[PDB]
């Protein structure tokens, strides 16, 4: 499960735990990816470091899969790749559009 081998794939622990556990850590761009009850797409739990007083902003995204290489997995309407990790890498290696993009792999 290449995903489970990354520094962000959290077991069956829903993003709530990933978020709860991850958000508690407060890792700038801290992310993780777990398999949703609907074992079809991978859910990535990410935490963004916010300056505001309200505290940092952490968010998760369910990786959307497709039937076109590499546009297979995507957690955005254009970010589709045959590799969540790559896409994970893309979620940071490229401008991105989600909470300070993927930064730290806080695999729950």
């Amino acid at each position: 499960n290449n995903l489970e081998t990354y520094e962000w794939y959290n077991k069956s622990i829903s993003r709530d735990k990933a978020e709860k556990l991850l958000l508690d850590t407060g890792k700038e761009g801290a992310f993780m990816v777990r398999d949703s009850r609907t074992p079809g797409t991978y859910t990535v739990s990410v935490f963004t470091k916010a300056i505001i007083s309200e505290n940092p902003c952490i968010k998760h995204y369910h990786i959307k899969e497709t039937n076109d290489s590499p546009k297979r997995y995507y957690v955005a309407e254009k970010y589709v790749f045959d590799s969540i990790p790559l896409l994970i890498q893309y979620h940071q290696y490229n401008g991105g559009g989600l909470v300070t993009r993927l930064r730290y792999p806080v695999c729950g």
Partner: peptide, 6 residues
């Protein structure tokens, strides 16, 4: 939509 609408 529910899951942090990427």
């Amino acid at each position: 939509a529910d899951y942090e609408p990427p």
